[PDB]
Design an enzyme around this catalytic site. Structure first.
Site, short mmCIF file in Angstrom:
data_model
loop_
_atom_site.label_atom_id
_atom_site.label_comp_id
_atom_site.label_asym_id
_atom_site.label_seq_id
_atom_site.Cartn_x
_atom_site.Cartn_y
_atom_site.Cartn_z
N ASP A 44 77.39 11.00 -39.08
CA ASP A 44 78.59 10.16 -38.89
C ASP A 44 78.77 9.03 -39.92
O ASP A 44 79.64 8.17 -39.71
CB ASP A 44 78.59 9.53 -37.48
CG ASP A 44 77.44 8.57 -37.25
OD1 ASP A 44 76.55 8.44 -38.13
OD2 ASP A 44 77.40 7.93 -36.17
N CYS A 47 73.72 7.44 -40.70
CA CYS A 47 72.49 8.19 -40.48
C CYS A 47 71.23 7.43 -40.92
O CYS A 47 70.22 7.39 -40.20
CB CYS A 47 72.52 9.52 -41.20
SG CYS A 47 73.80 10.59 -40.66
N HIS A 220 73.53 13.37 -44.75
CA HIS A 220 72.56 13.36 -43.67
C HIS A 220 71.34 12.51 -44.01
O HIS A 220 70.83 12.58 -45.14
CB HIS A 220 72.03 14.77 -43.41
CG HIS A 220 73.07 15.73 -42.91
ND1 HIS A 220 73.26 16.00 -41.57
CD2 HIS A 220 73.96 16.50 -43.59
CE1 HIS A 220 74.23 16.90 -41.44
NE2 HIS A 220 74.67 17.22 -42.65
#
Length: 226
Positions: A44, A47, A220
């Site tokens: 989102d 991370c 990520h």
């Protein structure tokens, strides 16, 4: 789509790549030589903060001394930011959540109960907001040092305002260096982004002994366990 997943086999990563992404497969395979499990964070834009926050607090369950050090630094951090110009009324609620999470670790919470806290959106995002503020405060305080990292014409403060303080603005090395120095913690990041099956470890700050291991891939940061 949980904020922080259960502890998963590293092999779950294969699902995140195309069948033809042969290099990413080779890196995942090599990662099995060094790590055993992964905990995914929701992708989102928060991370790094979320992964760092969970991994570090989880590690402090096993180090009472480091827990007390971390609590002391964290307690002081609020007055620190206020003295530097961050509005107290604005940031008090976020700091209170951060300190409550630390208290949870001090009370020797199970990992399962800590995980449940990190999966409550308000609780988890308040921690992230606070971590972003701590990172912005450190960058601004050491602005002469960090100036060279900032491409394009913005001041360090402008960079902080646009790229560090806002939710969903994903972290790079600038965030990580600053947060590690802010909290005097040591973070290892495996970059899976390198030459062959090699993911390339970076430790922040250089020369330290890390207790948090993260995996970076474009968009990520996940938590790794040996």
């Amino acid at each position: 789509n949980p904020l922080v997943s259960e502890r998963l086999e590293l092999s779950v990563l294969y699902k995140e790549y195309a069948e033809d992404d042969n290099i990413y497969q080779q890196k995942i395979k090599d990662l099995h030589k060094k790590y055993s499990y992964i905990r995914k964070t929701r992708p989102d834009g928060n991370c790094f903060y979320r992964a760092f926050g969970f991994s570090h607090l989880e590690a402090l369950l096993d180090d009472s001394k480091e827990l007390q050090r971390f609590k002391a630094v964290s307690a002081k951090s609020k007055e620190d930011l206020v003295s530097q110009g961050f509005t107290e009324f604005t940031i008090e609620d976020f700091h209170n959540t951060f300190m409550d999470l630390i208290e949870q670790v001090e009370k020797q919470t199970s990992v399962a109960d800590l995980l449940a806290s990190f999966n409550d959106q308000s609780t988890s995002d308040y921690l992230v907001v606070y971590l972003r503020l701590l990172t912005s405060g450190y960058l601004q305080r050491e602005s002469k040092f960090f100036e060279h990292f900032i491409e394009g014409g913005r001041t360090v403060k402008e960079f902080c305002q646009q790229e560090v303080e806002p939710m969903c603005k994903e972290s790079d090395h600038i965030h990580i260096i600053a947060l590690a120095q802010a909290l005097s913690v040591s973070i290892q990041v495996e970059y899976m982004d390198g030459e062959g099956g090699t993911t390339n470890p970076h430790i922040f700050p250089e020369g330290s002994e890390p207790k948090v291991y993260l995996l970076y891939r474009p968009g990520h940061y996940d938590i790794l366990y040996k």
